[PDB]
Design a binder for this molecule. Structure first.
Ligand SMILES: Nc1ncnc2c1ncn2[C@@H]1O[C@H](COP(=O)(O)OP(=O)(O)OC[C@H]2O[C@H](O)[C@H](O)[C@@H]2O)[C@@H](O)[C@H]1O
Length: 167
């Protein structure tokens, strides 16, 4: 049992809140926080940059070692690294960068990684700088993830739209 509070129920297993994922992670200290990564684990902005800053760059230092050993992730792929001061683990997941021509269908493959974890605190993959339609990312999440996922949506206007859209 985790201390997640104030979430709206979307489905049996998907919950959503208008919150900063960093603040949710700090408060709840979940087993798994999801990062919306790129294949290089170069955590520059959005969720990744905010998570990394909250770790005082430890996430990036760890990621640099991961890449030196293993090379880049696949689009749609993932790796499990430490959650540092935020969570036990961070699941770094790469959605497609639709703005750079990557196939939106890979967003389903990206969300499938969530099924390897019983409970996750997560963002909407690809819905920010990667350019996927946010409601589409939410619908793929709902239709793909079967484990318990707590979605933190930073943007108030976006949240208000998402929660009054069909799934
Ligand atoms: N602190 C936050 N808390 C919750 N949601 C957030 C936060 N910040 C942004 N969002 C929302 O989270 C959603 C995802 O936005 P993005 O983080 O851009 O992820 P992507 O998968 O599209 O792009 C990946 C790149 O982003 C990084 O630069 C990486 O290093 C990658 O290169 C949007 O709805 C945001 O409003």
């Amino acid at each position: 049992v985790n201390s997640f509070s104030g979430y709206l129920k979307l489905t049996d297993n998907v919950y959503i809140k208008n919150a900063d994922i960093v603040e949710e992670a700090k408060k709840v200290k979940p087993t798994v926080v999801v990062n919306a990564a790129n294949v290089y684990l170069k955590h520059g902005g959005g969720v990744a940059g905010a998570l990394n800053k909250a770790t005082n760059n430890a996430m990036q230092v760890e990621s640099d070692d991961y890449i030196a050993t293993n090379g880049p992730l696949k689009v749609g792929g993932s790796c499990v690294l430490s959650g540092h001061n935020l969570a036990k683990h961070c699941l770094h997941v790469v959605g497609p960068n639709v703005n750079k021509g990557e196939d939106i269908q890979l967003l389903k493959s990206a969300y499938e990684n969530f099924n390897q974890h019983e409970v996750l605190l997560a963002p909407l993959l690809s819905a920010g700088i990667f350019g996927a339609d946010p409601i589409h990312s939410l619908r793929v999440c709902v239709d793909t993830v079967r484990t318990n996922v707590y979605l933190a949506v930073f943007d108030k206007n976006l949240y208000d739209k998402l929660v009054s859209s069909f799934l």
